[PDB]
Short mmCIF file of C-alpha atoms and ligand atoms in Angstrom, two decimals:
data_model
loop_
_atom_site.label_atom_id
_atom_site.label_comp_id
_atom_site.label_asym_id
_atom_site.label_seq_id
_atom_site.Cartn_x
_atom_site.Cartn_y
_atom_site.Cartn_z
CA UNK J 14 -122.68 26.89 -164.40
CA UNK J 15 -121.55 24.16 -162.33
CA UNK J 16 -119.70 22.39 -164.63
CA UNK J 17 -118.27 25.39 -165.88
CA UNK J 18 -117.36 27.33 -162.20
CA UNK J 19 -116.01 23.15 -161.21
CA UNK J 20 -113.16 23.51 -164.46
CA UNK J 21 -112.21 27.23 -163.59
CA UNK J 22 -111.93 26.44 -160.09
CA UNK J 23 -109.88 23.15 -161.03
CA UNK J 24 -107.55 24.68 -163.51
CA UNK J 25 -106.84 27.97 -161.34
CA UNK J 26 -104.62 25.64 -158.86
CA UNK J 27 -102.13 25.95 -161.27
CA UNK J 28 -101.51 29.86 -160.26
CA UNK J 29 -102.61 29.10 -156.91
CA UNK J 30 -100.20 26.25 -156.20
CA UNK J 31 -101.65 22.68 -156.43
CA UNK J 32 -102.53 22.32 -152.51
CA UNK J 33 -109.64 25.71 -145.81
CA UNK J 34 -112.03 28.57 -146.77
CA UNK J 35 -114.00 29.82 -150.06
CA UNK J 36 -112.30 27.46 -152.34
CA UNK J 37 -112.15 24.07 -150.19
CA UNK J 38 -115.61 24.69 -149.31
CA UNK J 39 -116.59 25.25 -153.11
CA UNK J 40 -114.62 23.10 -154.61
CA UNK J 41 -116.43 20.00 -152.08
CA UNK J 42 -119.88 21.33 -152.39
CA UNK J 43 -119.03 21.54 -156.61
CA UNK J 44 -117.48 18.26 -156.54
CA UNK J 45 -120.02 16.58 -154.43
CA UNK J 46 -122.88 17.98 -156.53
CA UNK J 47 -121.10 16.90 -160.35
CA UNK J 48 -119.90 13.51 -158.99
CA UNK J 49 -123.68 12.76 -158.01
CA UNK J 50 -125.19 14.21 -161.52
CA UNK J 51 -122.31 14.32 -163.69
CA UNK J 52 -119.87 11.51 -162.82
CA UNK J 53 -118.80 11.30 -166.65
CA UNK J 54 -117.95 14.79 -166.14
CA UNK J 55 -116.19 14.56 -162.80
CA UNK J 56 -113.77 11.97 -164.20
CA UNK J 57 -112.62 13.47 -167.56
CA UNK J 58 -112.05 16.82 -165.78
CA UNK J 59 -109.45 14.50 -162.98
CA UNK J 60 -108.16 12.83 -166.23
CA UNK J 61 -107.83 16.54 -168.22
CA UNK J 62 -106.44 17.84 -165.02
CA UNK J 63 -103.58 15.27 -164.20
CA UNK J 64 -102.74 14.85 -167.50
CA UNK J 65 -103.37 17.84 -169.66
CA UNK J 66 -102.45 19.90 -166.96
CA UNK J 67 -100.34 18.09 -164.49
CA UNK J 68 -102.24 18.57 -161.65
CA UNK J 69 -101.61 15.96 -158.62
CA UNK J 70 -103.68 17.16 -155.52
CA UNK J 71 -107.14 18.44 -157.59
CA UNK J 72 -107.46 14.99 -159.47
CA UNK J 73 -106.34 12.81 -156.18
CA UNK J 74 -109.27 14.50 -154.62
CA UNK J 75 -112.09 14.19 -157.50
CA UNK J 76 -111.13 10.60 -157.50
CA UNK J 77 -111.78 10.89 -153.39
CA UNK J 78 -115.12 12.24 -154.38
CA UNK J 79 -116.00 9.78 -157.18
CA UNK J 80 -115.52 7.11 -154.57
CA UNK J 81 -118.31 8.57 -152.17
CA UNK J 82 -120.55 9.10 -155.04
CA UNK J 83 -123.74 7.09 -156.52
CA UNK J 84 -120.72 6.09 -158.88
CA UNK J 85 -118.99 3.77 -157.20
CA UNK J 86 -121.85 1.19 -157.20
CA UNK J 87 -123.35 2.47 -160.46
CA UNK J 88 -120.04 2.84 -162.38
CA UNK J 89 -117.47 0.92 -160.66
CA UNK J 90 -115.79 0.58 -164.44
CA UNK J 91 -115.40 4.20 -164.60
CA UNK J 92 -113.77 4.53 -161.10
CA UNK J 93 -111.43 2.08 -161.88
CA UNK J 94 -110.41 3.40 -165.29
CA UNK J 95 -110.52 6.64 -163.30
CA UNK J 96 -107.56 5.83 -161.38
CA UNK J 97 -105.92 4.04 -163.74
CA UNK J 98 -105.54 7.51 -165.36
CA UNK J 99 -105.64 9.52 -161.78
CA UNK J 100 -102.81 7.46 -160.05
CA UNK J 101 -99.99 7.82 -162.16
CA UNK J 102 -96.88 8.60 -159.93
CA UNK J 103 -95.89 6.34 -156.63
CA UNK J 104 -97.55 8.37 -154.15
CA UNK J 105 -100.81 10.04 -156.26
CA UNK J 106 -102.67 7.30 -154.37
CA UNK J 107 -101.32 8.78 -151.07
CA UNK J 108 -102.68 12.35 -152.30
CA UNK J 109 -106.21 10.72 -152.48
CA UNK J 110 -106.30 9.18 -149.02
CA UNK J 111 -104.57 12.66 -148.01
CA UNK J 112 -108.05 14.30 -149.08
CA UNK J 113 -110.23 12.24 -147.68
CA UNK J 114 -107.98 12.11 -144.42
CA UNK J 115 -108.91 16.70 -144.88
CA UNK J 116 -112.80 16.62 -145.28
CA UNK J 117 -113.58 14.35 -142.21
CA UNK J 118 -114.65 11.17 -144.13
CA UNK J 119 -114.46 7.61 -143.32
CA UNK J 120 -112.33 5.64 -145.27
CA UNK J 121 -114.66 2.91 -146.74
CA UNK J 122 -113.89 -0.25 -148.03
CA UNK J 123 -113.97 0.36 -151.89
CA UNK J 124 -111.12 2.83 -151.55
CA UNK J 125 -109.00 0.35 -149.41
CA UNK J 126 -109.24 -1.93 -151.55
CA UNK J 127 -108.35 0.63 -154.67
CA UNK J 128 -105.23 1.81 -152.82
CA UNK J 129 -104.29 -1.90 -151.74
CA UNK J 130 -104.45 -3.30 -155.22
CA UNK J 131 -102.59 -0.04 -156.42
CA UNK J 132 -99.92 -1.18 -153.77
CA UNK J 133 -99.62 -4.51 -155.38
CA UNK J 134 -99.07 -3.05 -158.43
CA UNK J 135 -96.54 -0.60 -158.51
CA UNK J 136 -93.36 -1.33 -159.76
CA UNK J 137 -91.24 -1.75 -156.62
CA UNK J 138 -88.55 0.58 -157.15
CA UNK J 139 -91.24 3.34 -158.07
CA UNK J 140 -92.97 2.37 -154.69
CA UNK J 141 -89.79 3.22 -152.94
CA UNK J 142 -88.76 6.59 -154.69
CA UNK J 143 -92.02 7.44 -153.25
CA UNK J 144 -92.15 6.17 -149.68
CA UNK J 145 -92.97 9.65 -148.29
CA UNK J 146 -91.40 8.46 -145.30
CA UNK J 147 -91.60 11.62 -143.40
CA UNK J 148 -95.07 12.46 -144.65
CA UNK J 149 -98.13 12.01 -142.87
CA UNK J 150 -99.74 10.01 -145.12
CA UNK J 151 -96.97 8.14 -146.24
CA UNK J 152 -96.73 4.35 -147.95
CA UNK J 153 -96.71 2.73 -144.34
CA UNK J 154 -99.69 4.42 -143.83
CA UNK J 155 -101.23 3.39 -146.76
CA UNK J 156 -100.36 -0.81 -146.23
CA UNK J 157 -101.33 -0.29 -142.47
CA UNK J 158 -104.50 1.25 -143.55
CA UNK J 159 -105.97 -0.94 -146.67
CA UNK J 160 -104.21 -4.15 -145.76
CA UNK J 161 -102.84 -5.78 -148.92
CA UNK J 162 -102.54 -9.35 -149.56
CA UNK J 163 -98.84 -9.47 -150.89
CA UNK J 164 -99.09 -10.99 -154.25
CA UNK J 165 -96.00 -11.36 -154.58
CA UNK J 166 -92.82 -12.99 -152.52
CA UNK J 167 -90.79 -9.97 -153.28
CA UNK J 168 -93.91 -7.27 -152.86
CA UNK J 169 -94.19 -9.23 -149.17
CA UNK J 170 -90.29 -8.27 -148.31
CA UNK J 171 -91.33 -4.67 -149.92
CA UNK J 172 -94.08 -4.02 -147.64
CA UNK J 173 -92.15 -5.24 -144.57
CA UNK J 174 -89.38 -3.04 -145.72
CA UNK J 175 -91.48 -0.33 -145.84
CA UNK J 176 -93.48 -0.49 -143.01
CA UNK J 177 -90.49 -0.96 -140.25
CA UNK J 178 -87.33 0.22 -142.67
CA UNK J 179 -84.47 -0.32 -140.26
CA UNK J 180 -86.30 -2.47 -138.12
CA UNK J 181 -86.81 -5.39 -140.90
CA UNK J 182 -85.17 -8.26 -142.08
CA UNK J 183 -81.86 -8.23 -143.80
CA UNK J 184 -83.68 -10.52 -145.87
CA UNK J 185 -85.64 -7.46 -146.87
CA UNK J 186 -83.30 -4.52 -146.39
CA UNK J 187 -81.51 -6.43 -149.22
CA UNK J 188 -84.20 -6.44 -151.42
CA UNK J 189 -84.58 -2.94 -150.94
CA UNK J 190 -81.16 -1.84 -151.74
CA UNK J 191 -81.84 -4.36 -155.39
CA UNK J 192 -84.66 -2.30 -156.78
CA UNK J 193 -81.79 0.61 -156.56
CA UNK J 194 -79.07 -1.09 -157.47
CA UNK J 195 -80.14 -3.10 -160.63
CA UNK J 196 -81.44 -0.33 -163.63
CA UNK J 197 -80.17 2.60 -161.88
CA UNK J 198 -81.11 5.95 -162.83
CA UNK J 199 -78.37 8.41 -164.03
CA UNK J 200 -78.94 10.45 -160.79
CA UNK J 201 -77.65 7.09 -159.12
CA UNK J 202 -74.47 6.95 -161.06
CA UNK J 203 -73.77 10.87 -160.62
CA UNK J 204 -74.96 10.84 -156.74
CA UNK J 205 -73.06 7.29 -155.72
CA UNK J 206 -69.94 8.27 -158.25
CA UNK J 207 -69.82 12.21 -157.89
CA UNK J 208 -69.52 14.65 -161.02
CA UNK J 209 -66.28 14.21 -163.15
CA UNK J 210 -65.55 13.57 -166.93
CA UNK J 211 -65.59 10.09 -166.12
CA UNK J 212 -68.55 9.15 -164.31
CA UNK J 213 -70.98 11.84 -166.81
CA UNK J 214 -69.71 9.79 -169.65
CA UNK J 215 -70.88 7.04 -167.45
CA UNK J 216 -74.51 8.42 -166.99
CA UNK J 217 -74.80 9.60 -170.91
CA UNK J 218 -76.47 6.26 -171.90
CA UNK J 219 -79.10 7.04 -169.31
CA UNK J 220 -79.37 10.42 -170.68
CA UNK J 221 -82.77 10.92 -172.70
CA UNK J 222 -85.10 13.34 -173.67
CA UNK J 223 -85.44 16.20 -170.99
CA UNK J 224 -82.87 14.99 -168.76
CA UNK J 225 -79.99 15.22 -171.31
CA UNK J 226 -81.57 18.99 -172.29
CA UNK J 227 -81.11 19.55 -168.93
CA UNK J 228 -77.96 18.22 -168.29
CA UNK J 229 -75.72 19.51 -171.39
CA UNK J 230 -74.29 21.99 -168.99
CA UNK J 231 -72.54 19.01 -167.12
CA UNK J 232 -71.97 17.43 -170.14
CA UNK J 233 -70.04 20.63 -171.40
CA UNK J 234 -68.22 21.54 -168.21
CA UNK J 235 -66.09 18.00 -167.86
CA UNK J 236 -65.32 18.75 -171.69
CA UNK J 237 -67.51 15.72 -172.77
CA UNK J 238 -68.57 18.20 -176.19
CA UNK J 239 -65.10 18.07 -177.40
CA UNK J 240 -64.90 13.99 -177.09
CA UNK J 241 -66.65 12.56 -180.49
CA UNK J 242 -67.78 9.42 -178.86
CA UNK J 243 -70.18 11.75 -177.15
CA UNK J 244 -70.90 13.81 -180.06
CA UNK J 245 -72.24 10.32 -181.89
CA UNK J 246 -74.08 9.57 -179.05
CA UNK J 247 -75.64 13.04 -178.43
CA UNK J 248 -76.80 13.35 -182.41
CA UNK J 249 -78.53 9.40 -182.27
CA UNK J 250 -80.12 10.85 -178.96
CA UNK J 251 -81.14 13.94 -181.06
CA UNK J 252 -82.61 12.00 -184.22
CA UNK J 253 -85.18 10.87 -182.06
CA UNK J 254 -86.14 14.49 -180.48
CA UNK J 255 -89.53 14.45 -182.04
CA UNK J 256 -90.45 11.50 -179.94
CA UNK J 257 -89.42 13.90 -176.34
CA UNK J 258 -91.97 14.55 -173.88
CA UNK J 259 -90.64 18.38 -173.52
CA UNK J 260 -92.29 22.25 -174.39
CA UNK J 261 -90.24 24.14 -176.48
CA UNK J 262 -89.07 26.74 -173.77
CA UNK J 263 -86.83 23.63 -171.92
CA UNK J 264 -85.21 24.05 -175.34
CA UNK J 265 -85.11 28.04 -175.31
CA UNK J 266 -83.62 27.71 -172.04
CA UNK J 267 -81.35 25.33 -172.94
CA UNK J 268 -80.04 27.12 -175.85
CA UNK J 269 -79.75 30.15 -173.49
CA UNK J 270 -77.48 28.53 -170.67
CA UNK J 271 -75.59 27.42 -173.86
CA UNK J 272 -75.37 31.21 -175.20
CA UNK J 273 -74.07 32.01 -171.79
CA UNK J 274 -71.83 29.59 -171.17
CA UNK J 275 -70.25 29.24 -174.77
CA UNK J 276 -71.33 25.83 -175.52
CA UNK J 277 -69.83 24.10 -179.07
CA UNK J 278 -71.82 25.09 -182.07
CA UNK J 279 -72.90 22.03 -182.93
CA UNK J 280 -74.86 21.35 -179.51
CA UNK J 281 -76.41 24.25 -180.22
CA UNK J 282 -77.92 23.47 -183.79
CA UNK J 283 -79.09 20.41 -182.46
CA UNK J 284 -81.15 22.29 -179.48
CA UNK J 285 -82.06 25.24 -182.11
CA UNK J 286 -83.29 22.47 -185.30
CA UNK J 287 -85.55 20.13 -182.04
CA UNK J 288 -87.19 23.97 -180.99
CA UNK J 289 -87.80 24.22 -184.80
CA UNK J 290 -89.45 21.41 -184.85
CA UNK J 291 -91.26 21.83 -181.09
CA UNK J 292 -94.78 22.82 -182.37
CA UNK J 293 -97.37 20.94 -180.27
CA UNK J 294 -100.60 20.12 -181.96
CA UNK J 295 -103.17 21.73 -180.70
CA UNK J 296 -107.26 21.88 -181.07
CA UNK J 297 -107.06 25.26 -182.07
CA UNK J 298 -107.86 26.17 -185.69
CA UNK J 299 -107.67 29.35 -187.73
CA UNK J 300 -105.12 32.34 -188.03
CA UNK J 301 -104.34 33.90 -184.44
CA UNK J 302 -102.65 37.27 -183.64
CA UNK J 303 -100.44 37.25 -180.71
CA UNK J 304 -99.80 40.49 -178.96
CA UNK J 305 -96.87 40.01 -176.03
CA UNK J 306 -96.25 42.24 -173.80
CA UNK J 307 -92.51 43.07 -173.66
CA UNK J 308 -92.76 46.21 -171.30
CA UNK J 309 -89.45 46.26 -168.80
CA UNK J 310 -91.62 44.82 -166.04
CA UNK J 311 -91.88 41.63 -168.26
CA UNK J 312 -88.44 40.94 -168.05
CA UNK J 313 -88.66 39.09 -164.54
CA UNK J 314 -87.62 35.53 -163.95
CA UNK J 315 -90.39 33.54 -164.89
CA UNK J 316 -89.87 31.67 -161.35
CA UNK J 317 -86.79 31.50 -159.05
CA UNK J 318 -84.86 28.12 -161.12
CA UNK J 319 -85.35 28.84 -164.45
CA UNK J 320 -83.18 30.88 -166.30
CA UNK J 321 -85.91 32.35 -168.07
CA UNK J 322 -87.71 36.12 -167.78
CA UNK J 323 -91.22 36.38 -168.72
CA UNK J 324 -90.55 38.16 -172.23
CA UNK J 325 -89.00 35.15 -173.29
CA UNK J 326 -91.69 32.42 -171.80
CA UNK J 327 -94.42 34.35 -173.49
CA UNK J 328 -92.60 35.14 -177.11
CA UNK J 329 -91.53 31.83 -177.24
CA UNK J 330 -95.04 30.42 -176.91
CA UNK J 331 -96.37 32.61 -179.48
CA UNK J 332 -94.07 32.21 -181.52
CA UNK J 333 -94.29 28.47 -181.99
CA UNK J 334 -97.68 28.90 -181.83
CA UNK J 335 -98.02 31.26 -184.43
CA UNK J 336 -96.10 28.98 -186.93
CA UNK J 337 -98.72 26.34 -186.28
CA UNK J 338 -101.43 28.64 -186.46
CA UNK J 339 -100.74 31.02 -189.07
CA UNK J 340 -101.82 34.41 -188.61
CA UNK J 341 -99.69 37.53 -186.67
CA UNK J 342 -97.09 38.28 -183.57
CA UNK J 343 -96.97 41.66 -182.26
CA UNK J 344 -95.36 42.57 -179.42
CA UNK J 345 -96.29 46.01 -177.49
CA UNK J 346 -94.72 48.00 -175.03
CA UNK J 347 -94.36 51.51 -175.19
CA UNK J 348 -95.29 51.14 -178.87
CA UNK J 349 -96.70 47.77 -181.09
CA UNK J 350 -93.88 46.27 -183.21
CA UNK J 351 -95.16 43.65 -185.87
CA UNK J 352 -93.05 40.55 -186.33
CA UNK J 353 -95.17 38.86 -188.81
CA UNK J 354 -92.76 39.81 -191.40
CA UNK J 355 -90.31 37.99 -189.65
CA UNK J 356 -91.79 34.75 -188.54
CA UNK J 357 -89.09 32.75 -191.08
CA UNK J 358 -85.99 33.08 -188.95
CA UNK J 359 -85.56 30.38 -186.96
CA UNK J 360 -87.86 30.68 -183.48
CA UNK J 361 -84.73 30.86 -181.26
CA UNK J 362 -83.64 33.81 -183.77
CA UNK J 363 -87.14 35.25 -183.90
CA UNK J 364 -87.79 35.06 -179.90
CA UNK J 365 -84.03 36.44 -178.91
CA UNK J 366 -84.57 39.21 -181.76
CA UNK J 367 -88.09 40.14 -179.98
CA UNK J 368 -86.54 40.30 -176.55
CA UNK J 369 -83.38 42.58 -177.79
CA UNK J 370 -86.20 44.79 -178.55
CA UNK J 371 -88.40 45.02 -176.01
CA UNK J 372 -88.37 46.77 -172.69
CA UNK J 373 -90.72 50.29 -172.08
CA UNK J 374 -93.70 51.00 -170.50
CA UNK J 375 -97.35 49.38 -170.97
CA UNK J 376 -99.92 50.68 -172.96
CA UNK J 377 -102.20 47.71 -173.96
CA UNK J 378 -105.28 49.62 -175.37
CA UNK J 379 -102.56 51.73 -177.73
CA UNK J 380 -100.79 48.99 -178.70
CA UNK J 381 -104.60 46.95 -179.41
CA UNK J 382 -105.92 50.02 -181.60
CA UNK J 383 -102.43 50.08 -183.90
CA UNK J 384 -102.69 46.09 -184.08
CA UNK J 385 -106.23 45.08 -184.17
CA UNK J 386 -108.33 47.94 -184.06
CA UNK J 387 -107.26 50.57 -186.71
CA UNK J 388 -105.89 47.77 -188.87
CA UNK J 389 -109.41 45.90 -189.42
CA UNK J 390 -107.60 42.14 -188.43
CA UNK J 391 -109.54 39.40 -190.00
CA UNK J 392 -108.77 36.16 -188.06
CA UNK J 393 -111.13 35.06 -185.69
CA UNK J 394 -109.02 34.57 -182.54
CA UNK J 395 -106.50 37.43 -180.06
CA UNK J 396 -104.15 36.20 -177.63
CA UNK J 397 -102.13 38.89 -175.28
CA UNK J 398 -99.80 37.69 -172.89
CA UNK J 399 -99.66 40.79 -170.32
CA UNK J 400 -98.61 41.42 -166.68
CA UNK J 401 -100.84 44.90 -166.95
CA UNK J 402 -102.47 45.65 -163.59
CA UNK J 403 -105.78 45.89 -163.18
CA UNK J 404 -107.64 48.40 -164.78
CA UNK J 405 -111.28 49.98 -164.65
CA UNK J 406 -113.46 49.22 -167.77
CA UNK J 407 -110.88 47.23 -169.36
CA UNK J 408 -110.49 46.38 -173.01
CA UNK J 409 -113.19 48.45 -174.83
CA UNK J 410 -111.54 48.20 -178.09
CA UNK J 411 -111.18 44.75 -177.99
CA UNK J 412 -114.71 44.71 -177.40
CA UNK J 413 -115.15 46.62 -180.11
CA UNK J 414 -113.57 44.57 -182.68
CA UNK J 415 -114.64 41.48 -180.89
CA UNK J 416 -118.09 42.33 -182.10
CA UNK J 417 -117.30 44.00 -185.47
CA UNK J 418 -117.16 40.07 -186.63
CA UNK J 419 -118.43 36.70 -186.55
CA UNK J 420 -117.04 34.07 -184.01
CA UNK J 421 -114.44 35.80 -182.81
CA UNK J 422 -112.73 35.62 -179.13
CA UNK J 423 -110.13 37.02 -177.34
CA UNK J 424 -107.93 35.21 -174.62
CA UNK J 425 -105.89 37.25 -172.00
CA UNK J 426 -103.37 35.52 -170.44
CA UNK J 427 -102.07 37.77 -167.17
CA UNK J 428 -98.60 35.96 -166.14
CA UNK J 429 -98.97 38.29 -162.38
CA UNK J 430 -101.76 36.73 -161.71
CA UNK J 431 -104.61 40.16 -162.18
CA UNK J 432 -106.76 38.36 -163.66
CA UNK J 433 -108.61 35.27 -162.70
CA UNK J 434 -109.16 31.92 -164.67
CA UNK J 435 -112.24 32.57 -166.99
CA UNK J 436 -114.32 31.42 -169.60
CA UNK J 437 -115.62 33.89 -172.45
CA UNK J 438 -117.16 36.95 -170.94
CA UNK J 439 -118.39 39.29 -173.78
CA UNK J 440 -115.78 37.20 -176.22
CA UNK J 441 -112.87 37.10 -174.15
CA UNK J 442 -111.49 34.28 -171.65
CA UNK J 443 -109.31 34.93 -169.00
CA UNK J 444 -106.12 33.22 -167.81
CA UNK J 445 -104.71 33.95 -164.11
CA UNK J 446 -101.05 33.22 -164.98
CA UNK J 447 -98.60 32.06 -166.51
CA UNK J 448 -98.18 28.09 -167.39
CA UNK J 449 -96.66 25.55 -170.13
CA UNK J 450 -99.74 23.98 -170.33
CA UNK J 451 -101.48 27.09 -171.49
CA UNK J 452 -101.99 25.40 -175.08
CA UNK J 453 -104.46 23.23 -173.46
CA UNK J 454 -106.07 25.74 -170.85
CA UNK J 455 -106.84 27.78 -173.84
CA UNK J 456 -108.58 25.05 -176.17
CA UNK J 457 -111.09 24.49 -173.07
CA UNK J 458 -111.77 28.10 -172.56
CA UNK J 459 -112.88 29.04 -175.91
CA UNK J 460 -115.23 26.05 -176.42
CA UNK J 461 -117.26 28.07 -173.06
CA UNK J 462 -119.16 26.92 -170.42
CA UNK J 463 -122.19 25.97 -172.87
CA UNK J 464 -119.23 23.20 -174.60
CA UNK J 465 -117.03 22.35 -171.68
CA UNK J 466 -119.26 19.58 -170.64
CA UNK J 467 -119.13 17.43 -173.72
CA UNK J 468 -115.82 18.56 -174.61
CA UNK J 469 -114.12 16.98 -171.61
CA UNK J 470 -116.12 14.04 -171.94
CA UNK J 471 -115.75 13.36 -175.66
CA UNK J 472 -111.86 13.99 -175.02
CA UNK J 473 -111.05 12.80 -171.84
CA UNK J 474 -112.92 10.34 -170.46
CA UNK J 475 -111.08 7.82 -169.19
CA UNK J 476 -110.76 4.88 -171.18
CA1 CA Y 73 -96.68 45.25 -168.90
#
């Protein structure tokens, strides 16, 4: 499948960094061939892909190949909405003339004049966060290339600023240091001012959503949790949680650093009540048993910033998953422990509980026979979050009670990367690693590669 070997392809970037051999040459001839038949398809999967799962080099580069396609005269309205849902940070634009810059293609007039209007239309101080002066294919490169007609008297002065920097006008140098100066960004106030009591309780106003989550620490350090002006501020900032763009382990690892550090109690009910409530909506119906694997070997930073081990990432994603879901969360190491039974503590209680005790060795098919197997389960759906290695013949029990039922499917997520990305193969999908956008990597697996085609269409074609 095409279509289907096009997604897998696409969505494996996110193990295999987001950007040649195998893959470039697969992933042009696959992308050629769908943007000529499919360019529907093509275009919800750079929507999905950017969006869904945050992928900036992949959908720059289906866009590239949209442009080159029989779609660009046949359905110029879809390229356009296209980008509109492709080009979403300052330099995304950039990443599409980078790709077509890679292949050896000329760059036509269609796509000039895409990336000039996009030029126009920025907001100016977003165009200048992302100059990617010392890039190749930077923002100069971009006005030098495609042209554009300033439609604006300030977006003249911003392409002349950009385009020679030191070498422009004062008249423009000015303007350029007024899209900084005027709605600054807390980073502004705590870069220009430095870090004291002072110039955080400054920044706090600008504070919202993931940025204050990540920034309590600050916060706490200058004392700012003790003052009560802050507290007031921090608990209006906190009534509107449910509206935060932010996954529910920013909020584990939150609460962690403030475990560590001894933050105030009350910070921390705040951060443990917005994880509470942190259950994404999801596609996915019907009771689910989650089996994590908490062997020692799980306990591994999930990457080299977060404060996070692996344990943690995966329990807390099944955990809030489960509650959505309904249905069971074992974990397994040397042995399966059942924490259904426990599932009404609080998820930061649950998830900290689990992870006091863990650790072991790893023996999947054991802990698969006590859980699913010898138990007779009767959901439809198995997730197992593992870091096993590789083994011959693998899963034969879960086969086995994959087809003692109906409809049912299995979904192995490997966080070290042994497995690849996969749809269903005998009833079980395959993940290559782990992600925080594995909620949505998981809804398009299990539709297959028969549904995958209509499903990213009928959800993500761009408007
Ligand atoms: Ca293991």
């Amino acid at each position: 499948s095409p279509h289907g070997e096009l997604f897998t392809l696409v969505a494996s970037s996110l193990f295999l960094g987001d950007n040649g051999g195998e893959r470039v040459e697969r992933f042009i001839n696959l992308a050629t061939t769908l943007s000529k038949e499919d360019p529907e398809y093509v275009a919800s999967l750079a929507n999905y892909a950017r969006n869904e799962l945050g992928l900036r080099s992949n959908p720059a580069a289906l866009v590239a190949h949209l442009f080159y396609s029989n779609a660009l005269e046949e359905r110029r309205d879809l390229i356009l909405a296209t980008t509109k849902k492709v080009w979403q940070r300052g330099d995304d634009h950039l990443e599409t003339l980078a790709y077509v810059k890679a292949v050896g293609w000329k760059l036509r007039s269609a796509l000039k004049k895409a990336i000039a209007e996009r030029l126009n239309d920025i907001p100016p101080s977003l165009l200048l966060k992302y100059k990617r002066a010392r890039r190749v294919v930077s923002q100069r490169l971009a006005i030098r290339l495609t042209h554009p007609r300033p439609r604006d008297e300030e977006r003249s002065l911003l392409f002349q600023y950009i385009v020679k920097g030191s070498r422009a006008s004062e008249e423009a140098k000015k303007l350029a240091e007024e899209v900084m100066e005027e709605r600054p960004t807390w980073e502004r106030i705590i870069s220009s001012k430095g870090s004291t009591p002072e110039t955080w309780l400054e920044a706090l106003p600008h504070l919202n959503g993931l940025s204050l989550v990540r920034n309590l620490n600050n916060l706490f350090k200058h004392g700012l949790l003790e003052n009560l002006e802050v507290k007031k501020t921090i608990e209006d900032k906190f009534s509107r949680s449910g509206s935060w763009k932010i996954f529910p382990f920013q909020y584990y690892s939150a609460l962690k650093m403030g475990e560590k550090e001894g933050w105030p109690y009350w910070i921390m009910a705040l951060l443990e009540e917005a994880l509470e409530s942190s259950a994404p909506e999801t596609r996915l119906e019907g009771e689910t048993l989650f089996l994590v694997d908490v062997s020692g070997s799980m306990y591994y930073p999930v990457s080299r910033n977060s404060n996070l081990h692996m344990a943690e990432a995966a329990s807390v994603l099944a955990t809030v998953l489960v509650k959505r879901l309904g249905g069971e969360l074992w974990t397994f190491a040397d042995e399966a422990q059942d924490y259904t039974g426990h599932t009404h503590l609080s998820t930061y209680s649950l998830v900290r509980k689990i992870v006091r005790e863990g650790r072991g060795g790893t023996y999947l098919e054991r802990a698969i026979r006590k859980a699913i197997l010898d138990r007779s389960w009767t959901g439809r759906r198995v997730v197992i979050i593992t870091d096993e290695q590789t083994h011959d013949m693998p899963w034969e029990a879960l086969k086995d009670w994959l087809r003692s039922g109906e409809n049912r499917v299995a979904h192995i997520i490997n966080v070290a990367g042994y497995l690849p990305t996969a749809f269903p193969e005998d009833r079980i999908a395959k993940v290559g690693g782990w992600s925080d956008k594995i909620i949505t990597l998981i809804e398009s697996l299990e539709v297959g590669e028969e549904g995958i085609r209509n499903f990213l269409v009928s959800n993500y074609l761009p408007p």
